[PDB]
Amino acid sequence: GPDQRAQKKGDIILGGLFPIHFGVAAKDQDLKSRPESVECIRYNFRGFRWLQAMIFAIEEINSSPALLPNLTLGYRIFDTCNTVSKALEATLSFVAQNKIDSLNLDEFCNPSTIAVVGATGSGVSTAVANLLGLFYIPQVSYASSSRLLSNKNQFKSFLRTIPNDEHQATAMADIIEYFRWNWVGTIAADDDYGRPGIEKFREEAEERDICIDFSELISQYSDEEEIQHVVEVIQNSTAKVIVVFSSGPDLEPLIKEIVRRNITGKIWLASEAWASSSLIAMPQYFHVVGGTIGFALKAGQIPGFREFLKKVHPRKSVHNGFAKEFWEETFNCHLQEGAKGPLPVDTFLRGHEESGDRFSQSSTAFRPLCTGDENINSVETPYIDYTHLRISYNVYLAVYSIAHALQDIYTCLPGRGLFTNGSCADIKKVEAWQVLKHLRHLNFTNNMGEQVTFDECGDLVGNYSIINWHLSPEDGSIVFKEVGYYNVYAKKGERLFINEEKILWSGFSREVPFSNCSRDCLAGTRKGIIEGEPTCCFECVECPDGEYSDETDASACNKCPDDFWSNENHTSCIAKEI
Amino acid sequence: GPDQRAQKKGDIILGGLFPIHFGVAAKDQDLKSRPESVECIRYNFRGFRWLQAMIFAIEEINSSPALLPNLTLGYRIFDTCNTVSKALEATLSFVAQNKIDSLNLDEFCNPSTIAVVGATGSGVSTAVANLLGLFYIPQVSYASSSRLLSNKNQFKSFLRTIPNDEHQATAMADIIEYFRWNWVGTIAADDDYGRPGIEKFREEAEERDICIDFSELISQYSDEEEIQHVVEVIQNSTAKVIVVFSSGPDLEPLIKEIVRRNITGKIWLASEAWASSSLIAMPQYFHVVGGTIGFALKAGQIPGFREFLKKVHPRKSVHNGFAKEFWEETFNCHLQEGAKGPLPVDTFLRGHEESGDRFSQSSTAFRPLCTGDENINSVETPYIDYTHLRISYNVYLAVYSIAHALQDIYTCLPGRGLFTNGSCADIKKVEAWQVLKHLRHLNFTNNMGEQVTFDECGDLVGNYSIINWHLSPEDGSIVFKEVGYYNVYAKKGERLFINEEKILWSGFSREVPFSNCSRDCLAGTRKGIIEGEPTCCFECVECPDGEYSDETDASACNKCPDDFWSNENHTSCIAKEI
Ligand SMILES: *[C@@H]1O[C@H](CO)[C@@H](O)[C@H](O)[C@H]1NC(C)=O
Ligand SMILES: *[C@@H]1O[C@H](CO)[C@@H](O)[C@H](O)[C@H]1NC(C)=O
Ligand SMILES: *[C@@H]1O[C@H](CO)[C@@H](O)[C@H](O)[C@H]1NC(C)=O
Ligand SMILES: *[C@@H]1O[C@H](CO)[C@@H](O)[C@H](O)[C@H]1NC(C)=O
Ligand SMILES: *[C@@H]1O[C@H](CO)[C@@H](O)[C@H](O)[C@H]1NC(C)=O
Ligand SMILES: *[C@@H]1O[C@H](CO)[C@@H](O)[C@H](O)[C@H]1NC(C)=O
Ligand SMILES: *[C@@H]1O[C@H](CO)[C@@H](O)[C@H](O)[C@H]1NC(C)=O
Ligand SMILES: *[C@@H]1O[C@H](CO)[C@@H](O)[C@H](O)[C@H]1NC(C)=O
Ligand SMILES: *[C@@H]1O[C@H](CO)[C@@H](O)[C@H](O)[C@H]1NC(C)=O
Ligand SMILES: *[C@@H]1O[C@H](CO)[C@@H](O)[C@H](O)[C@H]1NC(C)=O
Ligand SMILES: *[C@@H]1O[C@H](CO)[C@@H](O)[C@H](O)[C@H]1NC(C)=O
Ligand SMILES: *[C@@H]1O[C@H](CO)[C@@H](O)[C@H](O)[C@H]1NC(C)=O
Ligand SMILES: *[C@@H]1O[C@H](CO)[C@@H](O)[C@H](O)[C@H]1NC(C)=O
Ligand SMILES: *[C@@H]1O[C@H](CO)[C@@H](O)[C@H](O)[C@H]1NC(C)=O
Ligand SMILES: [Ca+2]
Ligand SMILES: [Ca+2]
């Protein structure tokens, strides 16, 4: 398929899809001549690291004698540029051999892909899944978390090492329940993410008897006026706990304004989409957004990866086409055409110093020089300058899923096969649909000792890492301290586990905040219903003359003995002086 | 003047001019509206280092109690962008106060610059000098080496810590003389550099009895045909020694072709313009260009400079306007608007990962993020990745020239002043023309222990460092090993001093090559003139019958005694058997 790729031979081929670029250029095709392939514009260092996580896991699988012995895992990895078009150009190459000809007569004419890792965006994954589904080629996504992809009617071969965004709303309710709060506020992104998330939360909240004071919608494109309203809505409210179902871009305008007005009290309940978002996790914002409790993807650990990442070289990395471009973008240089060794960067450019130079002639020619001798462990790029592996880990975990599903094919005995009936699959003549069947019944142990099995819908039955926003003493930046986990496999109530001692409320407090509508009614008063306000909002109605309320949180005052009467402050009855 | 600059207050102001950019953008001004200032395009890390050499020397002058005590040296440094226009915008600001008003009535209306450091290109310096000359403001250039600037009729206030390109041609002849060679070839750039250089060399060569076999002209814009001819001209010639008066760009096409044809023998005599040129000093080329002997600017040593260079910060460097742009270009990031601390580079860009993203909207917005916490000692840029200080040293040496000329003003006693007669100059009321007078009579000792005094024409009476092209064993690149010096102050013959032991001919030979037209005539033969060929091309004519040649290099054969006759091989006469 596409010219630029990361390809290596093997007995079984694995397809990769990664956003090495954030998008494609806005070229208006003249159509005056045969249109040429659009060019990808913003370099993604993180995306290239995700691509390396696939290669590394394959190389680790091939080195390990235990896993897939007498087999070589081969790969064909392309750049999606976060666009459906580029991602489909790649998918067509994966799909090409498999059944395209099987449907058509072209078989009379003339490298089968059995599984595909990817993609990042839920939009891109949907487009890829529509094509891979026709031939039942399994697709294991590392970052697409939209609830729409769970539909096994539409997506026949879709799987993901990332959990569905639905469970997050039920999880939020479980935390409100745990810290015994009944007065909350909701903020949502005015999109297919925030809206159903807050709606699902609203359903779960009313079930656990949690009342919502306010429900507001936000966007990245909201007016100064639209933001001013929500800010007032939060300020006017007595609820400290706010549940936010937004992304970093959509929530950023509102947060900027709350940081502008220095509104400290609020204790944030972060949605996965912004819980680890560095757009919000900014040190200038800690006054407001400090001590935020959120959901993250488990920060996995891949040993020897940092070393393998450092091993990249444009000449030495023969199976990585993107290695030259990476080198070129990480140093901002037009790499030397021919040979080593070290030479200054100016080399060509110093030609501009000449008094016989250009008038827009050599400016388009003379570019910074790369020898290939530069050290990458030096430069500050998201490639090596990273704190946690979450997506890189899901790319890792994605490859292993396919390897273990293939190992299950290799392992089964002729009477214990899944296929009709007891029939095992030939690993030499292995088909994509067979790997899909094995991936559905897959149960394997992670390289971190965690059980990795898939749901009916193809989602990873996995944990959400409960993280807390602390400020580093040494560093001076926001730190995501893991204070718990959310197991979606466990039964209702047994799904959540948090270590309160590890939490720092608002970023400094060590005592769990109060976020109930009305403070508990004392002795001398009873609970009174407030008209208009919800069930959890009560009035502390003083006991009538001749009645007393013994304990706190009393529904009604008790009448006193015929001979006795209420004391002055209605705590208990006293004897009538006769 | 211009908005962006490096400015600091002081008792006396020094003007700086540096190419922080290689040029300006090719904008065709619509003229449909008031044209806006053209933008500078290619970032020059080396140029910014040269700018730092000025600041560092000023800061070192201010810290040292010996030099200019009770005075603060102030500066106003601008970016020339290697263009006359940008360099003139700056110069106008320097010139502004001084006499512009003095000529005109505007004095009735409302920071004097006494000396200017710069510029790089001979073209730019000429344009600056034409303006500074009207007000006699001294200009000390660090890189402009054109012979045209020596004209004190045109350039009244021009000086330079770089020597004039003229002496180089006489120096070349002195080397040919030293290694006792008479058969050479010449190659020149078809411009105002190569042409007069080779012509001046041709004059000096004929004086020391050096014959030139071929004289060819080259360009960076020469045809494949034009280069093929010169290559043949060199190949067909018997001369090993070739004298090249070219720049790296102009000589590069010819060198590429000589490297293509693997012509090893040739021993190159490099002109300053290409002697240290990394465009030619490439390891792939060593087969041809190995052991090149050339002229360099003395590789000076500035202690504590590397430390000061590392001290740069966009926030912390308050007097350096270019510090933010440097930071931005050395990391390729749009620096954070407000505050610290460390944050990932993606931050904004990771917003492209969202499924509700742009169509050429956020692509123009989302840019890589800089915290200001990044380490510069890491990144491979010509700013810190440098081997020798030649131009940076001339910028250093330029500032010191002005400081010592000012110290001479401060030091003189009321009867020993240069001015009419014995009159000293008031340092509190110091004028630019007074500093110029002191710079002309300047004699001071360098921070390396070298005498720094200026010629009548304003050139630095300084050495040319004789360097040799060796290949590094550890590194694997071209090394410029200093094998001598060329003192232009010394008298004819006593100007040159080279250490033959330090030289490696062709890059490996330890024996001085043969580059004479004809090999010395032996015993039995005499020297015979070849018609058409020059004086140094001789024929070894065998002695006639009855004549003998006793020793080697004989002008004619001697007749034998009347009784005796020539021996068979004419070495000496033998007795006639009677
Ligand atoms: C808030 O209300 C809940 C109701 O379930 C209760 O458990 C909690 O203790 C209340 N908070 C206080 C401080 O009384
Ligand atoms: C409270 O909210 C209303 C709208 O819901 C708004 O008009 C008002 O300004 C807010 N704040 C105060 C101080 O009343
Ligand atoms: C919050 O905002 C005000 C605005 O004037 C500012 O002065 C104050 O320093 C801020 N609070 C803190 C603790 O930064
Ligand atoms: C294979 O097993 C399935 C599941 O029990 C059943 O539907 C099918 O009829 C069996 N086939 C045979 C050959 O018995
Ligand atoms: C297999 O899957 C079942 C059901 O999810 C689970 O109980 C079991 O622990 C998994 N692993 C093993 C080793 O049985
Ligand atoms: C979640 O945590 C439990 C307990 O540590 C573990 O068994 C499970 O496998 C983890 N989930 C994932 C995604 O591996
Ligand atoms: C009731 O009144 C007495 C006497 O003033 C006082 O000491 C007590 O605190 C009051 N309240 C309660 C809750 O007993
Ligand atoms: C080359 O000619 C010069 C003439 O001055 C002479 O000194 C030198 O020795 C000659 N070379 C040889 C090898 O004879
Ligand atoms: C020598 O030079 C002439 C032109 O000067 C050229 O025609 C010829 O090809 C060159 N080489 C040989 C091998 O004669
Ligand atoms: C010079 O050129 C030839 C061209 O075929 C090449 O094979 C040879 O290796 C070169 N010489 C050296 C020593 O590199
Ligand atoms: C000052 O000295 C110069 C040089 O000797 C001379 O031309 C000039 O006339 C002298 N002036 C006086 C006042 O004697
Ligand atoms: C001053 O200049 C003269 C002439 O160039 C020179 O001989 C002398 O050494 C210089 N320095 C001193 C300290 O006299
Ligand atoms: C040249 O070298 C001599 C001897 O080391 C020294 O006196 C002279 O000052 C040097 N030239 C320069 C440019 O300083
Ligand atoms: C002269 O001839 C003799 C006898 O053949 C020989 O030994 C000698 O080398 C010849 N040449 C010279 C330079 O003497
Ligand atoms: Ca993707
Ligand atoms: Ca300049």
Author numbering:
A (entry chain A), B (entry chain A): 21 to 130, 136 to 603
Provide the publication's sentences verbatim.
The extracellular calcium-sensing receptor (CaSR) is responsible for the maintenance of a stable blood Ca2+ level. In addition, CaSR contains a cysteine-rich (CR) domain that connects the VFT module to the transmembrane region.
Form I crystal structure of CaSR ECD represents the inactive configuration since the VFT modules of both protomers are in the open conformation associated with the resting state (open-open), and the interdomain cleft is empty. In addition, each protomer structure contains one Ca2+ ion and three SO42- ions. In the inactive homodimer, only minimal contacts occur between the LB2 domains. The inactive structure revealed electron density at site 2 that is consistent with a bound Ca2+ ion. The inactive and active structures share a common Ca2+-binding mode at site 2, suggesting that the bound Ca2+ is an integral part of the CaSR structure. In the inactive structure, electron densities revealed that anions were bound at sites 1–3. The anion at site 1 is coordinated by the guanidine group of R62 and backbone nitrogen of Y63. Second, the anions at sites 1 and 3 appear to stabilize the inactive conformation. Binding of anions at these sites prevent favorable interactions across the interdomain cleft that promote VFT closure.
